[PDB]
Design an enzyme around this catalytic site. Structure first.
Site, PDB file in Angstrom:
ATOM      1  N   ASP A 123     -23.363  39.901 -54.053  1.00 54.86           N
ATOM      2  CA  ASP A 123     -23.322  39.792 -55.506  1.00 54.86           C
ATOM      3  C   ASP A 123     -24.517  40.428 -56.194  1.00 54.86           C
ATOM      4  O   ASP A 123     -24.374  41.010 -57.280  1.00 54.86           O
ATOM      5  CB  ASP A 123     -23.184  38.326 -55.952  1.00 54.86           C
ATOM      6  CG  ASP A 123     -21.762  37.791 -55.789  1.00 54.86           C
ATOM      7  OD1 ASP A 123     -20.866  38.538 -55.345  1.00 54.86           O
ATOM      8  OD2 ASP A 123     -21.561  36.607 -56.136  1.00 54.86           O
ATOM      9  N   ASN A 172     -16.765  41.110 -55.916  1.00 47.79           N
ATOM     10  CA  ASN A 172     -16.085  39.956 -56.511  1.00 47.79           C
ATOM     11  C   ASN A 172     -17.167  39.107 -57.168  1.00 47.79           C
ATOM     12  O   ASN A 172     -17.099  37.871 -57.188  1.00 47.79           O
ATOM     13  CB  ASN A 172     -15.322  39.136 -55.460  1.00 47.79           C
ATOM     14  CG  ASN A 172     -14.326  38.162 -56.093  1.00 47.79           C
ATOM     15  OD1 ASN A 172     -13.998  38.286 -57.268  1.00 47.79           O
ATOM     16  ND2 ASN A 172     -13.815  37.218 -55.299  1.00 47.79           N
ATOM     17  N   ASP A 175     -19.613  24.364 -57.656  1.00 48.24           N
ATOM     18  CA  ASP A 175     -19.816  25.110 -56.409  1.00 48.24           C
ATOM     19  C   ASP A 175     -20.293  24.191 -55.281  1.00 48.24           C
ATOM     20  O   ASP A 175     -19.688  24.144 -54.200  1.00 48.24           O
ATOM     21  CB  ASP A 175     -20.822  26.248 -56.622  1.00 48.24           C
ATOM     22  CG  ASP A 175     -20.322  27.320 -57.585  1.00 48.24           C
ATOM     23  OD1 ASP A 175     -21.117  28.234 -57.882  1.00 48.24           O
ATOM     24  OD2 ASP A 175     -19.159  27.251 -58.051  1.00 48.24           O
ATOM     25  N   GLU A 213     -13.549  32.670 -56.073  1.00 44.56           N
ATOM     26  CA  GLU A 213     -13.377  33.603 -54.949  1.00 44.56           C
ATOM     27  C   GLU A 213     -11.985  33.609 -54.340  1.00 44.56           C
ATOM     28  O   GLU A 213     -11.511  34.650 -53.854  1.00 44.56           O
ATOM     29  CB  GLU A 213     -14.449  33.371 -53.884  1.00 44.56           C
ATOM     30  CG  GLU A 213     -15.823  33.951 -54.310  1.00 44.56           C
ATOM     31  CD  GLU A 213     -16.646  33.037 -55.225  1.00 44.56           C
ATOM     32  OE1 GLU A 213     -16.078  32.150 -55.910  1.00 44.56           O
ATOM     33  OE2 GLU A 213     -17.875  33.240 -55.269  1.00 44.56           O
ATOM     34  N   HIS A 252     -17.206  33.015 -49.225  1.00 48.79           N
ATOM     35  CA  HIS A 252     -18.440  32.541 -48.593  1.00 48.79           C
ATOM     36  C   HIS A 252     -18.508  31.014 -48.456  1.00 48.79           C
ATOM     37  O   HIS A 252     -18.896  30.497 -47.392  1.00 48.79           O
ATOM     38  CB  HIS A 252     -19.674  33.043 -49.381  1.00 48.79           C
ATOM     39  CG  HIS A 252     -19.675  32.674 -50.841  1.00 48.79           C
ATOM     40  ND1 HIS A 252     -20.814  32.251 -51.486  1.00 48.79           N
ATOM     41  CD2 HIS A 252     -18.701  32.710 -51.784  1.00 48.79           C
ATOM     42  CE1 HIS A 252     -20.548  32.038 -52.766  1.00 48.79           C
ATOM     43  NE2 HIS A 252     -19.271  32.309 -52.973  1.00 48.79           N
ATOM     44  N   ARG A 253     -18.112  30.281 -49.495  1.00 46.90           N
ATOM     45  CA  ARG A 253     -18.223  28.836 -49.392  1.00 46.90           C
ATOM     46  C   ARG A 253     -17.211  28.161 -48.483  1.00 46.90           C
ATOM     47  O   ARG A 253     -17.470  27.064 -47.992  1.00 46.90           O
ATOM     48  CB  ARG A 253     -18.240  28.183 -50.785  1.00 46.90           C
ATOM     49  CG  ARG A 253     -19.443  28.653 -51.628  1.00 46.90           C
ATOM     50  CD  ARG A 253     -19.848  27.654 -52.750  1.00 46.90           C
ATOM     51  NE  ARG A 253     -20.719  28.393 -53.660  1.00 46.90           N
ATOM     52  CZ  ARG A 253     -21.971  28.746 -53.394  1.00 46.90           C
ATOM     53  NH1 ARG A 253     -22.592  28.305 -52.293  1.00 46.90           N
ATOM     54  NH2 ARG A 253     -22.636  29.481 -54.279  1.00 46.90           N
ATOM     55  N   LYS A 268     -21.634  37.076 -49.392  1.00 44.92           N
ATOM     56  CA  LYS A 268     -21.521  37.145 -50.853  1.00 44.92           C
ATOM     57  C   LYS A 268     -22.781  36.547 -51.505  1.00 44.92           C
ATOM     58  O   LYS A 268     -23.280  37.082 -52.501  1.00 44.92           O
ATOM     59  CB  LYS A 268     -20.262  36.414 -51.361  1.00 44.92           C
ATOM     60  CG  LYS A 268     -19.997  36.673 -52.845  1.00 44.92           C
ATOM     61  CD  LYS A 268     -18.579  36.258 -53.268  1.00 44.92           C
ATOM     62  CE  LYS A 268     -18.246  36.707 -54.694  1.00 44.92           C
ATOM     63  NZ  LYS A 268     -18.918  35.886 -55.767  1.00 44.92           N
TER      64      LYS A 268
HETATM   65  O1  LIG Z   1     -23.221  31.771 -64.483  1.00 50.14           O
HETATM   66  C1  LIG Z   1     -23.389  31.573 -63.247  1.00 50.14           C
HETATM   67  O2  LIG Z   1     -24.406  31.893 -62.617  1.00 50.14           O
HETATM   68  C2  LIG Z   1     -22.293  30.877 -62.487  1.00 50.14           C
HETATM   69  C3  LIG Z   1     -21.431  30.007 -63.188  1.00 50.14           C
HETATM   70  C4  LIG Z   1     -20.289  29.286 -62.473  1.00 50.14           C
HETATM   71  O3  LIG Z   1     -18.996  29.812 -62.887  1.00 50.14           O
HETATM   72  P1  LIG Z   1     -18.004  29.061 -63.942  1.00 50.14           P
HETATM   73  O4  LIG Z   1     -18.732  28.955 -65.242  1.00 50.14           O
HETATM   74  O5  LIG Z   1     -16.799  29.940 -64.062  1.00 50.14           O
HETATM   75  O6  LIG Z   1     -17.660  27.696 -63.367  1.00 50.14           O
HETATM   76  C5  LIG Z   1     -20.452  29.290 -60.932  1.00 50.14           C
HETATM   77  O7  LIG Z   1     -19.250  28.776 -60.336  1.00 50.14           O
HETATM   78  C6  LIG Z   1     -20.829  30.695 -60.414  1.00 50.14           C
HETATM   79  O8  LIG Z   1     -20.964  30.694 -58.987  1.00 50.14           O
HETATM   80  C7  LIG Z   1     -22.155  31.096 -61.065  1.00 50.14           C
HETATM   81  O1  LIG Z   2     -20.514  30.971 -55.963  1.00 50.53           O
HETATM   82  C1  LIG Z   2     -19.440  30.294 -56.113  1.00 50.53           C
HETATM   83  O2  LIG Z   2     -19.189  29.265 -55.504  1.00 50.53           O
HETATM   84  C2  LIG Z   2     -18.402  30.766 -57.108  1.00 50.53           C
HETATM   85  N1  LIG Z   2     -18.813  32.034 -57.736  1.00 50.53           N
HETATM   86  C3  LIG Z   2     -17.968  32.651 -58.753  1.00 50.53           C
HETATM   87  P1  LIG Z   2     -18.671  34.109 -59.354  1.00 50.53           P
HETATM   88  O3  LIG Z   2     -20.154  34.005 -59.232  1.00 50.53           O
HETATM   89  O4  LIG Z   2     -18.142  35.248 -58.543  1.00 50.53           O
HETATM   90  O5  LIG Z   2     -18.186  34.164 -60.759  1.00 50.53           O
END
Ligand SMILES: O=C(O)C1=C[C@@H](OP(=O)(O)O)[C@@H](O)[C@H](O)C1
Ligand SMILES: O=C(O)C[NH2+]CP(=O)(O)O
Length: 427
Positions: A49, A94, A313, A341, A385-386, A411
């Site tokens: 990422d 992703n 998460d 994901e 990944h999770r 990821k």
């Molecule tokens: O802004 C961020 O850093 C994130 C917000 C979350 O997404 P959502 O707001 O869609 O739940 C989280 O699940 C993602 O891994 C990271």
């Molecule tokens: O990290 C996670 O568990 C979910 N991330 C979603 P994303 O960061 O790709 O929007």
């Protein structure tokens, strides 16, 4: 198909120095790129990422250098909005944190850029963000399916009154918040209704302030932003260790410790996932807090019934830890697990049943009743990944577990399995 098999782990104990926070890393990189001055980021996460964000900045013409281990980054700020023309294509894997934030940021001024990614990303919603950016003046075209990437961004976001739906992802609001300060006109961002993943908005405001910008937050219902601002380099900035990555190790101690200490995060952290420790405590584990660590020591493990919207998460880690708890565990208000994901409610329910649990896959919740004893299973990971990291916990039992496509942990945590091995003990 690659796979790895984890042998039963008799006990866990030790210390893990955490990899950098993905959430903090990608915000800090974008803000550093937009800012005036040179920013030095340390403890930056090296993962897919973040690599996609780094590659995007490279393609947009931003100059920076990385240390040998890719955790120290010296970025030469652009001193304003980033630009590219010719429908330049930026591939973002992703990585929602990169796709959503760049979709907004690159709407400043004029540009002609295309944002795309892996097949699953073309199935993850972004319509709420596009709707908001358009109300602010941006020209955005869906090149494939309406409401999803890929997007062709042709600029024009000037500010004004912008509504945004916060019910599916907090990332849309985060993207607007980081972008609006640089728009020529003032912006009033109105949240339509509910706001999920609220703690991530606090991470965004924290990072913006570090980079010299503050806004008026009216009880998270409306945000008033003054336009014509400029981000400024904070000099040297330390990226917090990842609290979501920490969850696996703290949960491992709650199940099979021993005491496991994670360093890089502590009681002062801005990440909402440090609250995951609170859940383990409610389940019966002992938690210790420090300035730069959090540790968990085995106590007992009882099932819980909790709304997990504030830690979506890290909440996945409770779903597999539940296999070891007494009673039936219910995790509620986690609908957006379905749009990440993979559809995580379908995936976690499917794989949990494979090791023996009875599971109710609710529309926006999951109910898990553990088996008297776990059985061996080959776990599918859904390019997530999770899923790989959560199911690694099955090995803290009398049965081994085989994890398919273990490299999917890259990821956010390439070195996950070696780190789990570090605290795995035979005696
Ligand atoms: O802004 C961020 O850093 C994130 C917000 C979350 O997404 P959502 O707001 O869609 O739940 C989280 O699940 C993602 O891994 C990271
Ligand atoms: O990290 C996670 O568990 C979910 N991330 C979603 P994303 O960061 O790709 O929007």
């Amino acid at each position: 198909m690659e796979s790895l098999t984890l042998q039963p782990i008799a006990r866990v104990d030790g210390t893990i120095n955490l990899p950098g926070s993905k959430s903090v890393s990608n915000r800090a990189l974008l803000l550093a790129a937009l800012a005036h001055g040179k920013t030095v980021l340390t403890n930056l996460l090296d993962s897919d990422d973040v690599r996609h964000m780094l590659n995007a900045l490279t393609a947009l013409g931003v100059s920076y250098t990385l240390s040998a281990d890719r955790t120290r980054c010296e970025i030469i700020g652009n001193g304003g909005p980033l630009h590219a023309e010719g429908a330049l294509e930026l591939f973002l894997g992703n990585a929602g944190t990169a796709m959503r934030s760049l979709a907004a940021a690159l709407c400043l001024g004029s540009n002609d850029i295309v944002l795309t990614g892996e097949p699953r990303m073309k199935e993850r919603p972004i319509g709420h963000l596009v709707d908001a950016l358009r109300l602010g003046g941006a020209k955005i075209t869906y090149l494939e399916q309406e409401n999803y990437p890929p997007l062709r961004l042709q600029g024009g976001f000037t500010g004004g009154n912008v509504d945004v739906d916060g019910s599916v992802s907090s990332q849309f609001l985060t993207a607007l918040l980081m972008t609006a300060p640089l728009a020529p006109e003032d912006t009033v961002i109105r949240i339509k209704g509910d706001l999920v993943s609220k703690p991530y908005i606090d991470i965004t405001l924290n990072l913006m302030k570090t980079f010299g910008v503050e806004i008026e937050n009216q009880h998270y219902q409306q945000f008033v932003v003054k336009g014509g601002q400029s981000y400024q380099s904070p000099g040297t900035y330390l990226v917090e260790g990842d609290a979501s990555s920490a969850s696996y190790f703290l949960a491992a101690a709650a199940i099979k410790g021993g005491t496991v200490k994670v360093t890089g995060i502590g009681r002062n952290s801005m990440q909402g996932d440090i609250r995951f420790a609170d859940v383990l405590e409610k389940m019966g584990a002992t938690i210790c807090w420090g300035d730069d660590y959090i540790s968990c020591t085995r106590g007992e493990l009882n099932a819980i019934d909790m709304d997990m919207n504030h830690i979506p998460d890290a909440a996945m880690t409770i779903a597999t830890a539940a296999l070891f708890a007494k009673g039936t565990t219910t995790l509620r208000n986690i609908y957006n697990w379905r749009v990440k994901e993979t559809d995580r409610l379908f995936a976690m329910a499917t794989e949990l049943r494979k090791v023996g649990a009875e599971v109710e896959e609710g529309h926006d919740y999951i109910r898990i009743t553990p088996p008297e004893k776990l059985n061996f299973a080959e776990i599918a990971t859904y390019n997530d990944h999770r899923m790989a990291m959560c199911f690694s916990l099955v090995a803290l039992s009398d049965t081994p577990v085989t994890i398919l496509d273990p490299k999917c942990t890259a990821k956010t945590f390439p070195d996950y399995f070696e780190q789990l091995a570090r605290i795995s003990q035979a005696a």
